[PDB]
């Protein structure tokens, strides 16, 4: 029985305040439908002004598998879902059965699948539907995972934008897309929601390849305003060269802190684009915000404090029509305002300030701890003796591991909001002080915004700034928007840039000890989004001093993993997926053919600038290895470039008759899936490795 889960979900929701917010009649309706479980016999007549064409969910028992699959495919196509991008296993008969079992406990939600079925609900009962969605999320994101609180924050906004305006004819764009689950539910994607953030399933972000209701997809913030202005200006130019559409952008307080968002706001006002900007004010700018920083728990930004006090303001100074602070969780008042905007027309850009609420084997080779925990522990140890370490983060204190540092040394942490560019330049200016050590913690994907500051402001001036790069390699369920696979490819193009790519926690400790002791080098350390390897794995597989000796023994000193005449093949591993190479090598030697006609050596590279050419020439010229295969956890242009270019410098292929091969993550969007599945997709896992090495050995003898 699943009813106990729904009862517990309802208990977790404060039902008493429903009366005060809405009214006695609304409270009674909600209590009867969702608490007393009293459903009318003809509730469709009571709650809907017109009859609704039901889905194939209620005619499932009368279908064979082939016909049922064809019918569900046609239904998804007619509701705008590009079903060919979803694996068929998802829309089978059993999955639809499970979804029906879930939806039977939702009298109004089980009968709504498209905006047309939404508009047949009586307006006065809109809060009731808003309650059902609230339970549904609590049942789905609990099982599949993803962003939760932000979805509840803007539930009424999505509901009312679907109810009132005519999408997809009218353009509506969200900012980060991690809170638009309700938008997906009422646009034809409800039945597939059990496949959230899996292989060939529903993404956690809006995608222009899932449906037509997703005008622009994003996972990086501060993008909605520019995107919606582009939509408005294109739809204005098309008519000019020959605007009944309503262009709406929903951006939160945190998103507006980003520079691109501010530029877009300024330009939207400047051009006077008839865009409604729903500023979702919720009190959260960074992740998280309750953490104590150098500026307290206050949300980051003078705009945030000004708007909280104002609850002429900033928007009015920028020549915006301002509708006062309107509750975002009140369907009545927001309905009034949005319906007025619909019936009328925007004669100038308008900001609808809205207040909302937020709080209200493979497995045996990885332990529970994370590399970021190791980073935090080392930084705490180094802070215990030296207080001149300054940490910065672009609104990612929790992910970067700085929260435990901000609590204990609040004056040592600067949370600049979503200000990657500002974070880099600020930290660089703070690193010019020889009496301070500055470490900047930023994700691999977010450094793509600040590469220009890394090059122009940090690399030209040789400023000794330490940059900690988190979430490097394959992230997992977040998707292609969060793929940290461009670190070595863009950092390796710069001089003065020491780059360290630890594979296990020991190399991470040594890299951070070097960064602590170093005072004249800009050092980047690539921390993977991965658990630390197990000690048993380190001993069995990896086979694993004063200041001057350590510094001499660390920089550019690669670690040796494994060391009719056989052909000798050496693999140069750079990155964090060395475990795949080790297991592939352990698997290959079982077969007699390769174990008789070949021998293998594995060399672990921890550096990209400078490179350990001594180890390369030890393998090439001393032990006379034949084949050379690189293995990097990065896309093209990384370690393969440096290894190939060093060999081309010295013309080793002519000298030693070397066959060369390269293995790296493919240059195709690594879609949302698990980390193991992501390894399997790019064919970089153990079995794919053994297959590829066998093919290469047996193709070039």
Ligand X SMILES: Cc1ncc(C[n+]2csc(CCOP(=O)(O)OP(=O)(O)O)c2C)c(N)n1
Considering only the stretches 325-333, 558-566, 588-596, 646-654, report the one whose residues sit in contact with a second copy under the rule CB under 8 A.
646-654
Burial class of residue 151, CB neighbours in 10 A (0-12, 13-18, 19+): buried
- Of 190 and 353, which has the nearer Cβ to Mg ion? 353
Candidates 38, 359, 411, 695; binder of a second copy (CB under 8 A) is 411
- Of 418 and 603, which has the nearer Cβ to ligand X? 418
In whole angstroms, the minimum distance from the beta carbon of 555 to a second copy comes to 18
Contact 532, 374 (CB under 8 A): yes
Please list every residue from 36 through 65 that binds Mg ion, using CB under 5 A.
none
Distance CA 19, CA 27 (A): 5
Burial class of residue 474, CB neighbours in 10 A (0-12, 13-18, 19+): buried
Contact 473, 575 (CB under 8 A): yes
Residue 271 touches which of ligand X, a second copy, Mg ion, none (Cβ within 5-8 Å per kind): a second copy
Please list every residue from 420 through 439 that binds a second copy, using CB under 8 A.
421-422, 425-433, 435-436
Contact 148, 204 (CB under 8 A): no
Candidates 22, 106, 414, 541; binder of a second copy (CB under 8 A) is 414
679 binds Mg ion (CB under 5 A): no
253 binds Mg ion (CB under 5 A): yes
Contact 492, 499 (CB under 8 A): yes
Instruction: Name every residue whose Cβ is closer than 8 Å to that of residue 316 and which is 6 or more positions away in sequence.
Output: 322
Please list every residue from 260 through 289 that binds Mg ion, using CB under 5 A.
282, 284
| Listed residue (536, 528, 613) closest to 572, CA to CA | 613
238 binds a second copy (CB under 8 A): yes
Residue 658 touches which of a second copy, Mg ion, ligand X, none (Cβ within 5-8 Å per kind): a second copy
CA distances from 24 to 11, 20, 160, 405 (A): 19, 8, 22, 49
638 binds Mg ion (CB under 5 A): no
- Of 416 and 629, which has the nearer Cβ to ligand X? 416
- Of 205 and 335, which has the nearer Cβ to a second copy? 205
Residue 179 touches which of Mg ion, a second copy, ligand X, none (Cβ within 5-8 Å per kind): ligand X
- Of 287 and 323, which has the nearer Cβ to ligand X? 287
Distance CA 179, CA 224 (A): 13
The DSSP line for 13-72 is S--HHHHHHH-HHHHHHHIIIIIS----TTHHHHHBSS-----GGGSGGG--HHHHHHHH
Considering only the stretches 80-88, 249-257, 318-326, 503-511, report the one whose residues sit in contact with Mg ion under the rule CB under 5 A.
249-257
254 binds Mg ion (CB under 5 A): yes
Distance CA 26, CA 22 (A): 6
- 453-472 exposure pattern, b = at least 16 Cβ within 10 A, e = fewer: bbeebbbeeebbbbbbbbbb
439 binds Mg ion (CB under 5 A): no
Site string for Mg ion, 71-110 (x = CB under 5 A): ----------------------------------------
Please list every residue from 319 through 348 that binds a second copy, using CB under 8 A.
319
Candidates 20, 64, 240, 622; binder of a second copy (CB under 8 A) is 240
313 binds a second copy (CB under 8 A): yes
| Residues 338-344: contacts with CB under 8 Å, at least 24 apart | 338/160, 338/161, 338/164, 339/164, 341/246, 341/276, 342/164, 342/165, 342/246
In whole angstroms, the minimum distance from the beta carbon of 26 to a second copy comes to 38
- Of 253 and 378, which has the nearer Cβ to ligand X? 253
In whole angstroms, the minimum distance from the beta carbon of 286 to Mg ion comes to 9
Residue 287 touches which of ligand X, Mg ion, a second copy, none (Cβ within 5-8 Å per kind): ligand X
Residues binding ligand X (CB under 6 A): 150, 153, 175-176, 179, 220-222, 252-255, 258, 280, 282, 284-287, 395-396, 418, 446
- Of 29 and 281, which has the nearer Cβ to Mg ion? 281
Site string for a second copy, 207-236 (x = CB under 8 A): -x------xxxxxx--x--xxxxxx-xxx-
Candidates 416, 515, 594, 673; binder of a second copy (CB under 8 A) is 416
- Three-state SS annotation for 187-229: HHHCCCHHHECCCCCECCCCCCCCECCCCCCCCCCCCHHHHHH
In whole angstroms, the minimum distance from the beta carbon of 442 to ligand X comes to 9
Strand segments, DSSP code E, in 476-613 are 497-500, 522-528, 531-533, 559-562, 567-574, 598-605, 607-609
- Of 422 and 559, which has the nearer Cβ to a second copy? 422
Distance CA 268, CA 278 (A): 14
- Of 167 and 421, which has the nearer Cβ to a second copy? 421
Contact 580, 692 (CB under 8 A): no
The helices-and-strands tally (H runs, E runs) of the chain is: 33, 19
Secondary structure element (H or E) that encloses residue 391, with its range: strand 389-393
Residue nearest to Mg ion according to CB distances in the complex: 284
* Angle 418-310-175 from CA coordinates, rounded to 5°: 35
Distance CA 303, CA 269 (A): 17
The answer, yes or no, to whether the previous bond of 597 is cis (omega within 30 of 0) is no
127 binds Mg ion (CB under 5 A): no
- Of 471 and 642, which has the nearer Cβ to ligand X? 471
In whole angstroms, the minimum distance from the beta carbon of 150 to ligand X comes to 3
φ, ψ of residue 524 to 5 degrees: the values are -110, 135
446 binds a second copy (CB under 8 A): yes
Please list every residue from 682 through 701 that binds a second copy, using CB under 8 A.
700
221 binds Mg ion (CB under 5 A): no
Residue 395 touches which of a second copy, Mg ion, ligand X, none (Cβ within 5-8 Å per kind): ligand X
In whole angstroms, the minimum distance from the beta carbon of 234 to a second copy comes to 4
Candidates 89, 388, 543, 614; binder of a second copy (CB under 8 A) is 388
Residue nearest to ligand X according to CB distances in the complex: 254
390 binds a second copy (CB under 8 A): yes
- Strands laid side by side in the 627-632 sheet: 559-562, 598-605, 567-574, 627-632, 659-664
257 binds a second copy (CB under 8 A): yes
Tell which residues of the chain come right before a gap with C–N over 2.5 A: 242, 311, 360, 544, 563
- Of 220 and 245, which has the nearer Cβ to ligand X? 220
């Amino acid at each position: 029985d699943i009813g106990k889960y729904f009862k517990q979900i309802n208990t977790f929701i404060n039902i008493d305040e429903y009366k005060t917010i809405y009214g006695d009649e609304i409270y009674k309706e909600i209590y009867e439908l969702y608490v007393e479980r009293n459903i009318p016999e003809y509730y469709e007549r009571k709650y809907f002004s017109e009859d609704i064409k039901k889905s194939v969910l209620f005619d499932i028992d009368k279908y064979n598998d082939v016909e049922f699959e064809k019918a569900i495919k046609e239904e998804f196509i007619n509701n705008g879902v590009y079903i060919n991008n979803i694996d068929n296993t998802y829309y089978k008969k059993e999955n639809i059965l499970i979804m029906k079992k879930i939806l039977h406990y939702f009298p109004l939600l089980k009968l709504i699948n498209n905006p047309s079925d939404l508009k047949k609900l009586k307006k006065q009962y809109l809060p009731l539907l808003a309650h059902e969605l609230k339970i549904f999320l609590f049942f789905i994101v609990n099982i599949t995972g993803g962003h939760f609180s932000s979805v509840l924050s803007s539930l009424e906004i999505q509901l009312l934008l679907l109810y009132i305006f005519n999408q997809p004819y009218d353009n509506v764009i969200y900012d980060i897309g991690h809170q638009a689950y309700v938008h997906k539910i009422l646009t034809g994607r409800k039945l597939l929601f059990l496949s959230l953030r899996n292989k060939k399933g529903i993404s956690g972000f809006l995608n222009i390849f899932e449906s037509i209701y997703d005008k622009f997809g994003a996972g990086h913030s501060s993008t909605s305003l520019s995107a919606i202005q582009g939509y408005y200006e294109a739809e204005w130019q098309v008519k000019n060269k020959e605007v009944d559409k309503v262009h709406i952008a929903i951006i939160g307080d945190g998103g507006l802190t980003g520079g691109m968002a501010l530029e877009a706001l300024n330009y939207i006002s400047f051009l006077n684009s008839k865009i409604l900007i729903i500023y979702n004010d919720n009190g959260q700018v960074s992740l998280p915000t309750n953490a104590v920083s150098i500026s307290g728990n206050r949300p980051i930004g003078s705009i945030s404090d000004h708007l909280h006090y104002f609850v002429n303001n900033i928007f009015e100074n920028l020549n915006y029509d301002y509708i006062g602070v309107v509750n975002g969780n009140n369907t009545e008042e927001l309905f009034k305002v949005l319906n007025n905007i619909k019936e009328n027309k925007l004669k100038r850009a308008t900001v609808l300030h809205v207040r909302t609420k937020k709080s209200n084997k493979y497995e045996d080779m990885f332990s529970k701890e994370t590399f970021t925990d190791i980073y935090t522990n080392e930084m705490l140890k180094y802070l215990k003796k030296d207080r001149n370490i300054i940490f910065l983060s672009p609104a990612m204190l929790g992910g970067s591991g700085l929260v435990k540092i901000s609590e204990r040394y609040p004056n040592n942490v600067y949370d600049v909001g979503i200000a990657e560019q500002h974070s880099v330049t600020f930290a660089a200016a703070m690193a010019m002080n020889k009496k301070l050590k500055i470490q900047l913690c930023i994700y691999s994907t977010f450094l793509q915004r600040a590469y220009d500051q890394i090059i122009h402001d940090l690399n030209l001036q040789n400023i000794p700034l330490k940059v900690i790069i988190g979430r490097s390699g394959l992230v997992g369920e977040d998707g292609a928007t969060h793929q940290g696979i461009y670190d070595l490819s863009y950092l390796g193009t710069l001089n003065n840039a020491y780059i360290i790519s630890p594979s296990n926690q020991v190399d991470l400790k040594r890299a951070l000890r070097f960064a602590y002791l170093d005072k004249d080098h800009s050092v980047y350390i690539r921390i993977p989004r991965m658990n630390i390897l197990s000690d048993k794995y380190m001993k069995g597989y990896l086979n694993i001093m004063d200041d001057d000796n350590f510094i001499k023994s660390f920089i550019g000193k690669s670690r040796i993993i494994k060391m009719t005449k056989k052909k000798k093949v050496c693999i140069f591993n750079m990155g964090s997926m060395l475990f795949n190479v080790i297991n592939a090598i352990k698997e290959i030697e079982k077969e007699q053919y390769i174990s008789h006609n070949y021998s293998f050596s594995i060399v672990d590279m921890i550096f990209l600038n400078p490179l350990d050419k001594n180890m390369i020439d030890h393998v090439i010229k001393q032990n006379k290895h034949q084949y050379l295969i690189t293995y990097e956890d990065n896309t093209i242009g990384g370690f393969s470039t440096h290894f190939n270019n060093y060999l081309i410098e010295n013309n080793y292929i002519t000298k030693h008759n070397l066959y060369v091969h390269n293995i790296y993550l493919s240059n195709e969007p690594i879609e949302h899936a698990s980390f193991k599945d992501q390894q399997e997709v790019v064919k970089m896992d153990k079995c794919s490795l053994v297959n590829r090495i066998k093919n290469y050995l047996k193709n070039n003898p």
